[PDB]
A paper describes a structure:
Utrophin (Utr), the 395 kD autosomal homologue of Dys is widely expressed in non muscle tissues (reviewed) but is restricted to the myotendinous and neuromuscular junctions of differentiated muscle and is located at the sarcolemma of developing fetal muscle.
Additionally we have determined the structure of a six amino acid longer version of the Utr-SR1 protein (amino acids 308–430, Utr-SR1-L) produced as a result of presumed proteolysis during crystallization experiments of an Utr N-terminal two spectrin repeat protein construct (Utr-SR1-SR2; 308–537). SDS-PAGE analysis of dissolved Utr-SR1-L crystals showed they contained a single 15 kD species. The Utr-SR1-L crystals are isomorphous with Utr-SR1 with insufficient space in the crystal lattice for the complete two domain SR1–SR2 structure. For the longer Utr-SR1-L structure we observe the start of the heptad repeat phasing for the next repeat domain SR2. It is likely that this rotation is a result of crystal packing rather than a reorientation of SR2 relative to SR1 although variation in domain orientation is observed for this protein family; a complete Dys/Utr-SR1-SR2 structure is required to conclusively define the inter-domain orientation.
Numbering used by the authors: 309 to 430
Amino acid sequence: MDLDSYQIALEEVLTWLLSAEDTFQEQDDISDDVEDVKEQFATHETFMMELSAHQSSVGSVLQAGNQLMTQGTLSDEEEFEIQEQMTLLNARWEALRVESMERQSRLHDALMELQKKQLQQL
Ligand SMILES: [Mg+2]
């Protein structure tokens, strides 16, 4: 019942996370040209908006797993399954969050740098 609904919500999250990881992995290196950097930067900001919008769902699933585990109604096998799912979900969410943020910093700095290199050639 609450096991079932946790499992449906975990599948929704993980389906979306696997693809967001793949998309992240497939974004190209930061381009040396300011018009290409604009588009990479613009693409990644939209991605960061996507991450943010999914953050409560990740936390919501992690909270549901935690409640199922503390409440005591589940088998030992199911608990080992849930604990491993929560541990890995949390590590994947966090890896993607850190790497995406680093990517955002680099694109921000690249775009500001390339723009200002245009400006000082007035
Ligand atoms: Mg943002």
